[PDB]
Amino acid sequence: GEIKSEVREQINAKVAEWREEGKAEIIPGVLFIDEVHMLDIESFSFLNRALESDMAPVLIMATNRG
Amino acid sequence: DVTRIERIGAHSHIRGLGLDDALEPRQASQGMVGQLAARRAAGVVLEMIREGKIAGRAVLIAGQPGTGKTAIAMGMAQALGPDTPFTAIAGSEIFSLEMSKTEALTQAFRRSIGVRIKEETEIIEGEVVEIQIDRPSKVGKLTLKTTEMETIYDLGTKMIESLTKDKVQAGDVITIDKATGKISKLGRSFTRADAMGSQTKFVQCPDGELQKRKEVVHTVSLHEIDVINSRTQGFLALFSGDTGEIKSEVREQINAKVAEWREEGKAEIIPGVLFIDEVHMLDIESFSFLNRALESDMAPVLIMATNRGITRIRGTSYQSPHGIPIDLLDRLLIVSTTPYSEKDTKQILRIRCEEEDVEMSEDAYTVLTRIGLETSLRYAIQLITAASLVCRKRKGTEVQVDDIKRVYSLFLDESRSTQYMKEYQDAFLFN
Amino acid sequence: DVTRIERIGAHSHIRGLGLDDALEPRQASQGMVGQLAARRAAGVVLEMIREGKIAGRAVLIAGQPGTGKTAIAMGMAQALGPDTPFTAIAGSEIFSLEMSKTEALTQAFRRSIGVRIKEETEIIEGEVVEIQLTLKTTEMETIYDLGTKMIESLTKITIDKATGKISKQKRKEVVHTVSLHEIDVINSRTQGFLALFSGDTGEIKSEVREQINAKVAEWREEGKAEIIPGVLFIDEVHMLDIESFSFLNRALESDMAPVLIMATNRGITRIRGTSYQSPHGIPIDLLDRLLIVSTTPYSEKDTKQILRIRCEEEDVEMSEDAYTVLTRIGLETSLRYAIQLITAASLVCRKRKGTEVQVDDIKRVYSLFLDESRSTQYMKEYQDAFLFN
Amino acid sequence: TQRIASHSHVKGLGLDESGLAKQAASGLVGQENAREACGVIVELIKSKKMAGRAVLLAGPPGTGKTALALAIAQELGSKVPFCPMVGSEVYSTEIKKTEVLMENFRRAIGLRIKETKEVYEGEVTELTPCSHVIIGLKTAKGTKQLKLDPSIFESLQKERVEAGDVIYIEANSGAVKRQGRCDTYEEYVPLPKGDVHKKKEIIQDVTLHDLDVANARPQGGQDILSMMGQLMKPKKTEITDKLRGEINKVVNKYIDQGIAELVPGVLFVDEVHMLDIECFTYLHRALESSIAPIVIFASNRGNCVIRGTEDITSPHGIPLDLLDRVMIIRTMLYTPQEMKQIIKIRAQTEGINISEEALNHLGEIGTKTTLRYSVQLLTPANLLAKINGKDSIEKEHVEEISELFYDAKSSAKILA
Amino acid sequence: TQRIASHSHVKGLGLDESGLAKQAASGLVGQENAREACGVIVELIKSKKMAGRAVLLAGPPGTGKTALALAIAQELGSKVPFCPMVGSEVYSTEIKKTEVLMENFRRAIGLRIKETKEVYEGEVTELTPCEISHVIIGLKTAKGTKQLKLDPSIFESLQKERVEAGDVIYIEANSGAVKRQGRCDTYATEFDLEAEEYVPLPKGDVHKKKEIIQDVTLHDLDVANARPQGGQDILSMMGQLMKPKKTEITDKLRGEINKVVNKYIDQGIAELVPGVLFVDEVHMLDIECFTYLHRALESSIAPIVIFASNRGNCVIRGTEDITSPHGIPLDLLDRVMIIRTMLYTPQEMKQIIKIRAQTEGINISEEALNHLGEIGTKTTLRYSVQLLTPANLLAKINGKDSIEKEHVEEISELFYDAKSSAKIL
Amino acid sequence: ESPSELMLTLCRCGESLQDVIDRVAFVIPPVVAAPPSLRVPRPPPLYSHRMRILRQGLREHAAPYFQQLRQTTAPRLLQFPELRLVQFDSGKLEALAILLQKLKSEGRRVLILSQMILMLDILEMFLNFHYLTYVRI
Amino acid sequence: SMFDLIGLENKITRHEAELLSKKKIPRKLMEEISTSAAPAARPAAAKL
Ligand SMILES: Nc1ncnc2c1ncn2[C@@H]1O[C@H](COP(=O)(O)OP(=O)(O)OP(O)(O)=S)[C@@H](O)[C@H]1O
Ligand SMILES: Nc1ncnc2c1ncn2[C@@H]1O[C@H](COP(=O)(O)OP(=O)(O)OP(O)(O)=S)[C@@H](O)[C@H]1O
Ligand SMILES: Nc1ncnc2c1ncn2[C@@H]1O[C@H](COP(=O)(O)OP(=O)(O)OP(O)(O)=S)[C@@H](O)[C@H]1O
Ligand SMILES: Nc1ncnc2c1ncn2[C@@H]1O[C@H](COP(=O)(O)OP(=O)(O)OP(O)(O)=S)[C@@H](O)[C@H]1O
């Protein structure tokens, strides 16, 4: 339930540190939100800024709405 | 003279359903007068409940306010008697922060099915005369005593540990479960009670056989079994109510195990009645669940009461006859209550005055009956006690029409209060 | 300079109500200018709080935005001092996932009443390094018997003469003021005092609250405690529900009720949780229990004096022409906007290697930063580009 | 020294011995008919024969509904449990509104337990065990040596008693407490009745809700695993109806045995209009119950929309079917003379001396704005009078305090 | 290598000494007025004496508001706490949104605390307890051997780590933390095969005291003291088994921590570095959150707050009918300084596209750059910069090392923008 | 009874899930505090006795599981520089690793000559990284 | 304590409770017990 933001910042910093020190290699994956029209405005607003991070995957969304 | 927790309530005078063995409602019997057709229908449904053959039959009691629906329900509960589960809830009680409305309805259903489980235990009880040196792998002797027998038992390691852990002492009455080797100390010897006194309790020596077969019948409900099996210490939820959405798999396992016991003759299923007063307060989701919860083989008889006209179902914009979806109305039989004539209102008031233990003049009865016909039955019932108090303050033995007029002027009914409000409505907040 | 946790906030200049002994408000004093009638009303309310005899009195500070209602509240808090409880919340803070709105308001009410308890301890100890116990001091030398093992830790200071409590030259007396909320959170659990910090208190039961009220009344009668009635300040009270307001109605009728100060800046609006319109977003039944103090919009000279006080609070020197330009701006846009222009213009002058804020600095800051009206106009001009109009 | 509340002047209903209302008595002026109704329902509560009877005090704001309920409470005394409540209190994040209502019903029924409590005290433990425990107790007045159980011995060890540490030990429970370690050999017992064998008749008042919550979870640190129950947050739960029935049965047993007395009390629901339709619908069945208390509702609403319905308007914000089962007491507006009487009563209660012309001007202000506003000006006006060296409130002070503070109507006009 | 994000090109505000914005510098082009205002705000944050000052970045989407906020962050540097936040993050399932806002306020205030660290490290020569008030432990390094009397807590942590003898351990006295980092090197030769790892014995002193600077925020102190993790008493240990939920930290804990921090500042062992809280999509906050921000910005402890909103006359969330300029209540707009971002000319868009191409390592021909600028004028700036990577991929598929116009045309045909998609809808 | 399994992995298709946790478990709280204490002058005897009874009883109940109770609930207050950073910080050690592994397989022995004592300490660390036994002169 | 129903779950069963109710030392026998002398007539072991 609601992993702390500072914990995630620490994870990110240590993963970058691992990458610089030859331990870790980052594999960016794909997040597929099927029926993305079921998200509300708040979720879309978060998605806007969640995509600005360097640890953000490629996002595929599908929707039949018009 | 002495006040108990139960005292004069609204329905305390309904001792049962006043109908013959032919299910013909007597005009006035068991504290219930009038509503002949609805009482006959209630008798038929009561016989259905007593036979316990048909599962998930739903009955709706409909009618105007003050027409006796809860009176008929309480009469059914009083004729049914204890040891047949009659669960009474309001439709509001299912909206809980603990669990979903579906879960609450499921618990209410599981609470209306009663299980009588019998077991044989084969225990040993006796006053302990001696426990001797176990120092050797430890081995010891235990001497047990009834008023007719005493025997000496050779103790294994586990029994020795149990006896030393309970600090079993010479001169106390224990019971030993042979299957489990479980020691229960229930009292101290009859050779003292002789200067003691503490958490201890004093018991006289058992008489008869040291070893006794015993049949104990345990009465539980399906809900109780569910919450006992829900978690390791789940029986505490029978007290706190902290049940939290018992798993469906647990309920299926319990249903299967109960069916096994019933085939084995171990368990006896007593199906009961779930009474939901004010069923119009349920959501369309709850009615949808009731549609299917009734179609289970372990479903009780569902009785619901509603005074609604043609209202919108809660959670929807749809107008349905009793605030209940039409698919659920097809699944039930509707008992309708006719309003009360002057004779019926007078009889009801007489029975209520008998319950209150208040004596009223005949002119007072006429005036109060007219007041009830004008205003409402419940208002007249309340005026009964109010006028009794006003009479007592007057140092009179019989309530007169003057006292009824006094309490009528002191206490308003809905219509007169609404009128006084209406002429002053600019002084009241929000219209 | 060293940056402390307390920095230059909006109301840092306010040291209290600038009030005479007759409660008459000085034109400018203790960081507050103008609002003579409102300041006088706050002074009489403050005398009511200090007297502390009448329980559950409610005062509402009403006026246009930026008229100093929160400033009057902070001045009242500064005048009241740290020894009487002053609980400040926003109307939004009662909407909690831990507790109901009723519980949040109850806790806020019980955080404003303080019980003062003075205890006599026993402390004589001093300069000792020896081991068994004998003690020596510049004026004292003593021996003490002992029949317990606590001395082992004491070896490696001062002790209680009564119970022998050990901790690293006379009886001395200690005063502790404890709020009712602290008392019932400490006594709600085995380690309930932790919930005073974590907030994991979760709807203290009415039973314990009743018992603690009874015990506090007993202590008051027996002289062991005295009640220090405080004041609860609810800023932006229009965020409360109709349920919250109805609770406040009868919460104020306890003898353990603090003095309630509420601030609101809206006219006849909808009460939250209802479709009804009421003068302050507050139901009329609660307004019935309130004394309402209204704040007048500031004049030109009052605005200039406020700007002067804020400038000397922020330690920025401006020219007189800059003061007149900024006063015109404040009268044209808002007081808060000018207050912020002060800091921005000080920064612009600093980049310039200047020492005094000139009119050109204020013009530059006015160009860089917009008020609501100018931004709204530029928005209207680009209406289509913006989202969801 | 205690503080003056809004209802601190309400000492009772102020009725004569025939039940009629004195014009002004025990802090109440006017509302004679409502007061007489409150008196008859006080007699109803003291009769303790009727359960789940409901009374609604309906009238404009400020007409003394809450004052009348508090007067009823005063007329009953602290013997009878008076549970005050607001309709907003049913909305809890922990339990459902129905559980909150049921609990408040539980705590409006009181139980009075009579016990003859025996205890053994003294300088104590002049002996510890001379199969048995022998302890000598000396308390100035004398000394007794008594024989205890071995179980009392284990409890005594648990309490780490030593020879010379005053203790409690009760014959009715076997519970033991070492009250002190008076360093004479840190507290020693007094000597009014400083006997070793102490027994006196005790009465403790407990509500049925207290019994329910006591039986809701284990008793805490005594048991192996209930010790970890003390580390939990004290969440309130939906006490099952079966537990209530069982507690009722045991309470009835002990009422029959004559050691307990049933004192049913009053549940006062102020701002009943804040309950939603679910709460009222439950209240139907809660009032049908024979184990329910006497319930007093108060509403100032004119034709409000019932909460939780969004469309349905009923007279007092209360559903019609609930109004059908309650008795209505009508509170009316106050004449200016009654307002003057009330202002004088409040001034006297607050220790405020008021001149005659000041009282008349304040009564005029109240007739213009409202009774509450005029009652509120008293303390600030007294403070102003004290500032200006006076001990009586004069017309100038009330004028100045009226100019400093506004009523709802004046503020609304400024806002419009 | 490092992954390229949508803002990786912004390295600052590109302002000269006098604060005037260079047309293109530090990865930013245009928005000179907004960049200059942001430079003023950077100076405000560096001044460090003003608390609770809020700025609002207002302009249509695509105008660079988040870019300017991150440019401010770059200007400040990693030393100053920059807490980014979105309005949608307040709606937590565990704590009230007011608590989330206050926590974000508290983690935008940073502390640099100099702490003396007491270290015991060495080979365990002996471990002798005394009834259990003591443990006598001998520690051996290259410098020498010492035996120390340590608390029962350290002994019982040593039992947790299971250190017996010949084990190299690291004890931090402050936290009571024991680390068994292996067995001594001298015991490697004992056996051909042993189931542990050998570490050389420490070469320093047994008892080392070290001064270190710790970077923490006020929120770190609040959370540590509201969910205590130090201390070895059983009561706190059993509380550690609870699910670590976020709790509504009370104002009393924050006041106590304020007192502690003030004491540290007086003692010279701490320095306050108040930072900035960046709430993007502030329009997502409901009326309750804005009305709380009213109070949260009056606090003398508050950080600098930056808001960004692209909405024109949106209804305030939670109000259901109240239209305010930027989705933000007017009473809050009275507390902020508004920095407006303007739309871009075709030339500025072309410059931005070239900068993004440079950052993504993509060679684009002049024809392709002009065509992509034309597309961006027709569609949007965001659409054009997104075409660059797919166009480069197609160019590599064709075997060319630069993006020609045909690749841009192909990618334009394969993908659509919101306007074309809306047309076909 | 009920079923159960350990064959369940997390993301790797591999080892015993405590090695996984150890591999990825590195965060330390920025601040660690002992629980706040209630500073009461002369606490009441009943309260102190109750607290003592509770603490004593909770212990001797967790005593059978005290070691487990502590492995859990023990925060990570320290994270050390991992041993692999040696030999990654230096290219000399990176080449020496290959050289020494080859020399080990070939059976030869080695003596490493370095002027710096401190680099000898670093070499001790590096040799332990490769499980190579040595003597220091 | 007589209203402590939850505690009794750890202690006894209903058959045990019915047993106890039937077997509780009657009042008369209590005074008989407290009057009479100790009947210490144990025949001692025989091993026949
Ligand atoms: N024979 C009777 N039939 C109906 N009500 C009776 C009868 N005798 C007494 N009453 C009383 O009449 C009142 C009417 O209430 P009920 O109708 O039984 O309950 P209810 O839940 O309100 O159902 P309603 O009013 O029809 S919606 C109660 O106080 C009953 O105790
Ligand atoms: N106490 C007051 N005295 C005089 N005018 C007031 C007062 N309170 C509010 N107003 C007026 O109300 C206007 C708007 O107030 P706000 O608090 O910003 O929003 P509002 O009053 O709720 O209005 P809306 O549009 O109905 S939400 C102010 O600009 C004032 O003109
Ligand atoms: N008849 C009365 N005699 C004396 N004081 C009264 C009387 N009625 C009301 N008061 C007092 O006048 C003030 C306002 O009356 P309240 O009792 O608080 O309001 P209420 O009528 O009880 O409840 P509301 O306002 O109608 S919802 C309080 O201080 C009361 O104690
Ligand atoms: N003046 C600028 N110079 C350089 N890059 C810019 C400029 N303005 C915007 N960008 C960038 O162009 C892309 C889109 O701008 P963003 O700032 O991410 O979105 P946005 O339009 O600022 O968000 P909002 O809040 O709706 S304005 C990002 O890669 C930014 O870095």
Author numbering:
A (entry chain D): 266 to 331
B (entry chain F): 15 to 150, 156 to 212, 216 to 453
C (entry chain B): 15 to 146, 161 to 184, 193 to 204, 233 to 453
D (entry chain A): 12 to 141, 155 to 209, 218 to 448
E (entry chain C): 12 to 142, 154 to 447
F (entry chain G): 1808 to 1944
G (entry chain G): 1411 to 1458
Quoted from the paper:
We also reasoned that unresolved, flexibly attached density present in the endogenously purified TIP60 complex could be reducing the accuracy of our image alignments and therefore the final resolution of our structure. Thus, we decided to reconstitute the P400 subcomplex, guided by our initial model of the endogenous complex, for further analysis. The 2.6-Å cryo-EM density of the reconstituted P400 subcomplex allowed us to visualize distinct features concerning the arrangement of subunits around the hexameric AAA-ATPase ring of the TIP60 complex. By contrast, the ARP module within TIP60 is closely attached to the hexameric ring (left) and in a location also completely different from that of Arp6 in the SWR1 and SRCAP complexes (center and right). Our structure shows that a fragment of the EP400 insertion domain (EP400_Loop) buds out of the hexameric ATPases ring and forms a series of interactions with the VPS72 C terminus and DMAP1 in the ARP module that positions it distinctly within TIP60. Specifically, E1474 and K1457 in the EP400_Loop form salt bridges with R314 and D307 in the VPS72 C terminus, respectively; the main chain of V1467 in the EP400_Loop forms a hydrogen bond with K91 of DMAP1 (top); and A1460, L1463, and F1464 of the EP400_Loop establish hydrophobic interactions with a cleft between DMAP1 and VPS72 C terminus (bottom).
The human Tat-interactive protein, 60 kDa (TIP60) complex, a fusion of the yeast nucleosome acetyltransferase of histone H4 (NuA4) and switch/sucrose nonfermentable related 1 (SWR1) complexes, is involved in both histone acetylation and H2A.Z-H2B histone exchange and is essential for cell viability, playing a role, among other cellular processes, in gene regulation and DNA double-strand break repair.
